[PDB]
Amino acid sequence: SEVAHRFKDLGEENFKALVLIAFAQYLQQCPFEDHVKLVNEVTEFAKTCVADESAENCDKSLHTLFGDKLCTDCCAKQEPERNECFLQHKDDNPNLPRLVRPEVDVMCTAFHDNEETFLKKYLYEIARRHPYFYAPELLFFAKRYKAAFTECCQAADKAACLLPKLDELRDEGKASSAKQRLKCASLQKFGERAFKAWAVARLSQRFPKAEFAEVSKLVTDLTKVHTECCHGDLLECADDRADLAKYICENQDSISSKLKECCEKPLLEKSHCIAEVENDEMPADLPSLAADFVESKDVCKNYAEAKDVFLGMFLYEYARRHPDYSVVLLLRLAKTYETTLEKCCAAADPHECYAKVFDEFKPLVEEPQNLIKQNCELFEQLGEYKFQNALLVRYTKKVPQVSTPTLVEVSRNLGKVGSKCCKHPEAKRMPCAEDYLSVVLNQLCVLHEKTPVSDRVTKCCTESLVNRRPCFSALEVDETYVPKEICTLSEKERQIKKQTALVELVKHKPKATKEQLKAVMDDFAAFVEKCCKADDKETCFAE
């Protein structure tokens, strides 16, 4: 039996949570209570199978069990089709009510009143809104969400304790979710071969000192971990993640110097810690690449006898000595390299043909560096909010077909690059920026996927995972496009209206000039400013 094997390894507490998540991600509209029942059933039944591993129905696969309970058009179907069904019925942007925290004391009453139902409430509300959220991590998040109610519902000021943490958690959760969503899209839309390269790139960067053989292993295990979490095999996802976190720490010496602090802590903390570690220090004298990937006489041989292992050995070797490069760059270079080997090893003298393959890299490397230098100059020259509007406008013109809420949402997130990254030294900027942008652009891509309107966005999104940022950056304003025919708000609120309006304002006269925008923008901000001052306001807003 399988249920048992998990219940045991994960413990009831976590089992129960995961199983909840699994469900609330699968059916996002279904009410809270409605799930908890199904959870508790499943949980009781598991226990039975813990007692009698050869009890009735314990012979079944989790999917079947879960799908079944859930089913109490997808449900007219059977495994595996059925599961794939639910997996493809996941909504990235539900028409679910905005989330809003009732007054502090109100929560602090409910938290002591019913502590369990309260956390389950949290997991439930997040999970249905982030159907691709990294389940294990969501537990970390939940414990840290408990830890704040424990303390702050027990101090002089609750509001100036609790809320400030919850603003941090919402922020952090939004990032994690978005980052994970990239992982899941990479896998599902580009297949594992592709994720593997990504991992190989990133981990070679976290763990320079590690021999390829180790990194390959890690990549395997990690890929297995994510594959599962994205195919909705959360229980196994978490276990396997644990087992991985346990593995890494035993073999620490052969992986990174940095892990010690992380490895010392509890199951949940350390898996996150590790995920988040700093890059290990760059080993000393590492033979220049060129020897084995350009000057060698056996390039064209090894690419024949083991293209994967060879190109991997390459990605590894280049990645480990470039923590300054984005992953997506490194992948591109890897692709260029593969490509060129392909053409060259079909020539008269291949040594000659491929000999200059590094010259090809200068462009691919520079294209990003410039772009970042420039919009970091820009960022510091404008500040984040204003900075967001320039991206807003830039992009809105590029894809005036995309829905306003999405445009705003994405633009704003593009905006944070500046503040996130521009404070770093050049050395650490590009992997910060570009790889963040790769996440945000993926939000676009998926939100767009749902309800497609712009063949250009689609092209960029589907054509290649790695070249998306250049593909988007490339885009000139869309000429085909046919022009489109409250006072008691927080700053962040006011911003999102103003911006929302800005998009409509661009969609109206795309061939606008920054000046004749300044002019219309200002006009309207004045309008709202005056119509805030009062009288019978609505009578004022008459226009």
| Euclidean distance between CA atoms 217 and 223, whole angstroms | 10
Report CA Rg, the chain: 26
Which stretches of 399-454 are DSSP H helices? 404-421, 426-450
Closest among 212, 215, 202 to 276, alpha carbons compared: 202
| Euclidean distance between CA atoms 8 and 2, whole angstroms | 10
At residue 468, φ and ψ (nearest 5 deg) are -50, -55
Judge whether 318 and 330 are in contact, CB under 8 Å: yes
The SS3 assignment for 496 reads helix
Judge whether 226 and 184 are in contact, CB under 8 Å: yes
Q: Residues within the annotated binding site?
A: 2, 9, 63, 224, 228, 231, 233, 236, 239, 243
Side-chain-facing half-sphere of 188: CA atoms under 13 Å: 18
Judge whether 420 and 387 are in contact, CB under 8 Å: no
- N-to-C CA span, the chain: 68
| Euclidean distance between CA atoms 86 and 65, whole angstroms | 14
Q: Residues within the annotated binding site for (4Z,15Z)-bilirubin IXalpha?
A: 224
| Euclidean distance between CA atoms 39 and 17, whole angstroms | 9
Q: Residues within the annotated binding site for Zn(2+)?
A: 63, 231, 233
| Euclidean distance between CA atoms 206 and 200, whole angstroms | 10
Residues 267 and 291 both lie in one domain: no
Judge whether 283 and 209 are in contact, CB under 8 Å: yes
Closest among 517, 495, 497 to 508, alpha carbons compared: 517
Residues 258 and 286 both lie in one domain: no
What single string gives the DSSP state of each residue in 96-151?
A: --------HHHHHHHHHH-HHHHHHHHHHHHHHH-TT--HHHHHHHHHHHHHHHHH
Sequence-separated (6 or more) residues with CB below 8 Å from residue 193: none
At residue 278, φ and ψ (nearest 5 deg) are -75, 155
- Assign residue 225 the CATH number of its domain: 1.10.246.10
Residues 16 and 6 both lie in one domain: yes
What technique was this entry resolved by? X-ray
- Among candidate residues 366, 390, 411, the one where a domain is terminated: 366
Residues 114 and 25 both lie in one domain: no
Q: How far is CA 344 from the centre of its chain?
A: 37
Place of tokens 């200068």: 362
Residues 220 and 276 both lie in one domain: yes
| Euclidean distance between CA atoms 100 and 124, whole angstroms | 14
- Among candidate residues 49, 67, 91, the one where a domain is terminated: 91
Amino acid, res. 543: E
Amino acid, res. 264: E
Place of tokens 């890494």: 248
Closest among 188, 111, 178, 181 to 151, alpha carbons compared: 111
Judge whether 186 and 194 are in contact, CB under 8 Å: yes
Helix then strand then coil, % of the chain, to nearest 5: 75, 0, 25
- Among candidate residues 331, 366, 401, the one where a domain is terminated: 366
What single string gives the DSSP state of each residue in 200-223?
A: HHHHHHH-TTS-HHHHHHHHHHHH
Residues 371 and 473 both lie in one domain: yes
Place of tokens 């009831």: 12
At residue 77, φ and ψ (nearest 5 deg) are -115, 165
3-state secondary structure 383-402: CHHHHHHHHHHHHHHHCCCC
Residues 236 and 265 both lie in one domain: yes
Sequence-separated (6 or more) residues with CB below 8 Å from residue 365: 325, 329, 333
| Euclidean distance between CA atoms 232 and 225, whole angstroms | 11
Distances (CA, A) of 431 to 229, 280, 443: 25, 15, 18
Distances (CA, A) of 467 to 239, 333, 402, 436: 34, 11, 20, 14
| Euclidean distance between CA atoms 502 and 525, whole angstroms | 11
What does the block give as tokens for 495? 């911003």
Judge whether 15 and 6 are in contact, CB under 8 Å: yes
Place of tokens 């700093």: 278
The SS3 assignment for 322 reads coil
At residue 348, φ and ψ (nearest 5 deg) are -65, -55
Residues 53 and 76 both lie in one domain: yes
Judge whether 110 and 153 are in contact, CB under 8 Å: no
Residues 331 and 410 both lie in one domain: no
The SS3 assignment for 155 reads coil
Residues 454 and 381 both lie in one domain: yes
Closest among 354, 246, 228, 232 to 301, alpha carbons compared: 354
How many C-beta atoms lie closer than 10 Å to residue 325's C-beta? 24
DSSP 209: T
| Euclidean distance between CA atoms 19 and 42, whole angstroms | 8
Residues 380 and 460 both lie in one domain: yes
| Euclidean distance between CA atoms 132 and 184, whole angstroms | 7
- Domain ranges, residue 437: 367-478
Judge whether 408 and 503 are in contact, CB under 8 Å: yes
Q: Residues within the annotated binding site for Ca(2+)?
A: 2, 9, 228, 233, 236, 239, 243
Q: Which helix (H) or strand (E) holds 259?
A: helix 259-263
| Euclidean distance between CA atoms 522 and 239, whole angstroms | 56
Judge whether 429 and 376 are in contact, CB under 8 Å: yes
321, burial (CB in 10 Å: exposed 0-12, middle 13-18, buried 19+): middle
Closest among 290, 285, 331, 286 to 312, alpha carbons compared: 331
| Euclidean distance between CA atoms 200 and 185, whole angstroms | 17
Place of tokens 């045991």: 8
| Euclidean distance between CA atoms 288 and 244, whole angstroms | 32
Longest dimension (CA), the chain: 85
Q: Which helix (H) or strand (E) holds 189?
A: helix 162-190
Side-chain-facing half-sphere of 424: CA atoms under 13 Å: 15
Residues 39 and 23 both lie in one domain: yes
CA dihedral 472, 476, 477, 479 (to 10 degrees): -120
Judge whether 39 and 16 are in contact, CB under 8 Å: yes
Judge whether 235 and 62 are in contact, CB under 8 Å: yes
Q: Which helix (H) or strand (E) holds 479?
A: none
Q: CA angle 510-93-447, nearest 5°?
A: 45
Resolution (A): 3.2
Counting the structural domains of the chain, the total is 6
| Euclidean distance between CA atoms 261 and 219, whole angstroms | 22
Length of the chain: 543
Distances (CA, A) of 46 to 15, 49, 56, 160, 386: 10, 5, 11, 42, 54
What does the block give as tokens for 114? 């019913």
